[PDB]
Amino acid sequence: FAPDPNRPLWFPGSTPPPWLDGSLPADFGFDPLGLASDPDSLKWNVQAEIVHCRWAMLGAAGIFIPELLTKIGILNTPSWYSAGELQYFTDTTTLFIVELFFIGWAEGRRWADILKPGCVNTDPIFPNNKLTGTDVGYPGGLWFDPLGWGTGSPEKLKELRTKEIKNGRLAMLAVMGAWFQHVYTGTGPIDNLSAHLADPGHATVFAAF
Amino acid sequence: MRDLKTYLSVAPVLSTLWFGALAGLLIEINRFFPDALTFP
Amino acid sequence: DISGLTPCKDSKQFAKREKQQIKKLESSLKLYAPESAPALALNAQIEKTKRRFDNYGKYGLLCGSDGLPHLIVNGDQRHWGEFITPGILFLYIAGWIGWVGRSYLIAISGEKKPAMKEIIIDVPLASRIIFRGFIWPVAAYREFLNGDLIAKD
Amino acid sequence: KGEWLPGLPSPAYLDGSLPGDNGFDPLGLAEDPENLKWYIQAELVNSRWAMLGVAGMLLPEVFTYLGIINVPKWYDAGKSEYFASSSTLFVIEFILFHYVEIRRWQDIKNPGCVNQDPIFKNYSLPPHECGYPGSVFNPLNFEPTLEAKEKELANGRLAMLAFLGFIVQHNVTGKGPFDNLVQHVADPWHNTIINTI
Ligand code: CLA
Ligand code: CLA
Ligand SMILES: CC(/C=C/C=C(C)/C=C/[C@@]12O[C@]1(C)C[C@@H](O)CC2(C)C)=C\C=C\C=C(C)\C=C\C=C(C)\C=C\[C@@]12O[C@]1(C)C[C@@H](O)CC2(C)C
């Protein structure tokens, strides 16, 4: 992961900021507000972007795959927007508290990783189970990298991480798109796509007045 | 970034943030527990 | 009861005050449609007044010859909820604030120019200090015995 | 020496020599050595009392639920009728504890003052460590190893947390601990702290 001063930029013909160097994957020189000027801020922001990207990828899958299969009839899942207010085997509060406990353990160990890199790579109960990762944000090991694709040449690793970051950015945009589309149109996302494909000249945002 | 965090740690800005949070807390407590003369 | 006061559940002046407040609120209700939002807002005020008076009755407050609650401070065991318990809670919050202030003033004392951390606050240091006031009575007591509380000049 | 929060460095004054040291002092209560010496004794006595208290509240209720014995609840045993009336019992307790706790305090102030008994000057407590008298207090001659002290402190801390749980559960439900456990285990997913609020 070496400097790349001739990489494509978000704004062709401009000069990338000095802190955006090109060693990080998926770097296009985009930081107009100077939010990552400090090295510590950049270190924190990289991890924040990674976790946001992965969570939004899972969210995009969970919204768009089940709702496409409902329109085909392979599944009969309810709408994603109102799926939170349905009745389950337990009330929503205890589900949220159990999720808080479990995800809090996981997130606290991730926080310990961020603050101190080695720190938490070893099993608390069985000393022999270790995470084989090396860089922060990529824990590795049998649990988070069973197939071994997470380690390799310093050149294929950069592109493998760039694909992840760009897919996560796209999913991050898509989740908010689905949310606002449901707020402003009153129907599902696949309905919106089909309606827009039927009448692209009219079935848009401006078809609300 | 560092300089802006230093500025946000200056006395008046921290004071207005702290007192705004305090005022919001007290206002919400009074909205949900109004007209308290004693402590049951 | 105490000092010639009667409980507010018995005193007729308290009920008369409650009736007059509701009557005053209901006179402005006549100027609006029964379904309008101002009519809905004055009804909420009427329910709030009813709940307030019912609570003042239930808590067991003493009322004078004017229909207004009167506080008992001397130390009566059936009136601790008016001065004693709130006072203890206030003394716990204020001691918390004072102890967190004292610890922060002590922590920045030994620096090159300690007046810069008094106008530009070291927020991480304050975050470290802040939650030490939860056990402020124990520490305040313990620096009293050892002698780290008072400067002997 | 373990870590209560993996990653957080241990405080300097917590050297790993004391039994039960896991580097847990986020609020800096034990920074002064004079305060730490006092807090060790306080922890030992509080854990030892909480152990017996938790046993006394829990076990007779378990044996009452099984039908072997029939005794009142821990929160109801106070207003029962005994042979001596509550005030007399309190006065006797106050006198006896005023003796024994001052005898113990004299040892905390200086280690070897009150080893000898007044009435029978022949006997004396052999030299020991603070909080661990032994001899008469250890009739069966169990060896005070580091493992034993670590177990004692761990079980005592668990007992203090159990006592706090008992008090809060009785305050918020009005029933005893074991019946709360039975109600929870009967249907875990609808009998939690959330359903009582
Ligand atoms: C993530 C990508 C993405 C995609 C593919 C779509 C696609 C669509 N949106 Mg949409 N949207 C998005 C993000 C996206 N949106 C975001 C982030 C928001 C929140 C501001 C919205 C808010 C929104 C509303 C309020 C409405 C739509 C509507 C629509 C449909 C009609 C087209 C239109 O009017 O667009 C309008 C687009 C916008 C207002 C903002 C989109 C800006 C995104 C971020 C850029 C996308 C292009 C970018 C180069 C990436 C390309 C991806 C590639 C696959 C092409 C169409 C299916 C309409 C609909 O339901 O049709 C009936 C409609 O009413 N969208
Ligand atoms: C660290 C905070 C702190 C502490 C511990 C004290 C403590 C004390 N002050 Mg004091 N004081 C303070 C701040 C503080 N003051 C400030 C900021 C002012 C200027 C407004 C004063 C003005 C003042 C006067 C004029 C008098 C005292 C007096 C006293 C003494 C009696 C208690 C009293 O009257 O309180 C009353 C306290 C106040 C009226 C001021 C309180 C101001 C706020 C609540 C404190 C906020 C501190 C800081 C902003 C928070 C630190 C945050 C940090 C973690 C980053 C007591 C030793 C009296 C005395 O000497 O008699 C013995 C007296 O006459 N103080
Ligand atoms: C959009 C977004 C962030 C956008 C930020 C942008 C553009 C910032 C840009 C800048 O900072 C830079 C780059 C550089 C600066 O110099 C300039 C600016 C401009 C300041 C994050 C979204 C992030 C969105 C995320 C993480 C969403 C995750 C969603 C999940 C997990 C959804 C789950 C569910 O949908 C399922 C799966 C099933 C349902 O039934 C239940 C639920 C729970 C609803």
Ligand SMILES: CC(/C=C/C=C(C)/C=C/[C@@]12O[C@]1(C)C[C@@H](O)CC2(C)C)=C\C=C\C=C(C)\C=C\C=C(C)\C=C\[C@@]12O[C@]1(C)C[C@@H](O)CC2(C)C
């Ligand atoms: C002694 C004790 C209880 C004793 C109970 C007894 C005798 C009960 C007796 C009875 O039941 C019987 C027998 C029979 C019943 O019929 C009658 C009664 C009377 C009801 C509890 C102690 C209970 C003590 C407790 C709960 C202490 C908790 C302290 C904590 C958690 C402090 C933690 C920290 O201090 C550290 C560790 C490090 C800091 O840096 C950070 C913080 C967090 C501040």
Ligand SMILES: CCCCCCCS[C@@H]1O[C@H](CO)[C@@H](O)[C@H](O)[C@H]1O
């Ligand atoms: C919420 C607790 C953490 C909040 C941190 C906010 C910025 S912390 C901030 O950092 C500046 C340097 O960048 C320092 O000059 C300043 O003293 C300090 O308060």
